[PDB]
Design a protein around this nucleic acid. Sequence first.
DNA 1: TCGACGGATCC
DNA 2: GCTGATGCG
DNA 3: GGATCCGTCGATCGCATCAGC
Length: 276
Amino acid sequence: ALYEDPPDQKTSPSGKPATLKICSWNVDGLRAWIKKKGLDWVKEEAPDILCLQETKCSENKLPAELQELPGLSHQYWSAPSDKEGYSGVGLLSRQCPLKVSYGIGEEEHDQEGRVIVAEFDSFVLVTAYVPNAGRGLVRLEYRQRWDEAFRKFLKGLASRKPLVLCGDLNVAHEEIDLRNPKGNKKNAGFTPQERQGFGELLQAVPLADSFRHLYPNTPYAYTFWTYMMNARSKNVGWRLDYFLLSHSLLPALCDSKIRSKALGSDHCPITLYLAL
DNA sequence: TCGACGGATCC
DNA sequence: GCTGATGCG
DNA sequence: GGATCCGTCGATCGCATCAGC
Ligand SMILES: [Ca+2]
């Protein structure tokens, strides 16, 4: 059926109020997103950090609009080495980061403008747009190598600070994260492989799926629908966009939300509340 | 995601 | 700037 | 032999490039 995201639990497990609001969103064309009034929604939601994926836009072609955009003064972008109009991500922050890193530190996996690291005082934040296993699973082979590297770099990372990873992970973890599971079991995004990966990643690093940590059994809660075949109309979507918390931060987690009613892409923005 | 094709297999 | 076509997802 | 089963396998909607002029 349809999903109604619950109201915002702005208090910790321990009564301490939320201090830190990170928002994440696969934009799918940053210029079209802004033309489609997405930045309005950003302004009204007033996050402390905004992460975007699928920006499909190069550094200089970046629009003027997000220059004026206040409260998200520090802005960082990666966009692929040699392929224009493709991929790209960006991280905007109200407060200034301690240190910003691009890519995951392997050549093979750092050429498509997918990953921004940003270390803050008490945590480190990664935003990524995981590569699609490709239609016809033509790039499935690659993405098993991506996953294994993303893992071993995310594990190294968490070893030092506690981390929040957000972004589009291109994996529909379980059959509850998919409107049509059985008609998708070797479509990309729900292969035995990619769900296998997600599982390794949660057990490897380790990381909790914050949405499923608070709503382990809510169905029909989705983050993406194809513009085709009326997919968002019937909410026949997926859950592709996660907030993957280190276990240290589980006592800081106040809520984890999915802002379905927010138009402008084929994805909807998600939103994390922590007490930090 | 959807519907058209298949080629089966069923009462 | 404009038309076509192709890429990606 | 006709009506239902379940595996394929074809155009859709959107964003952005590219070639060419
Ligand atoms: Ca292609």
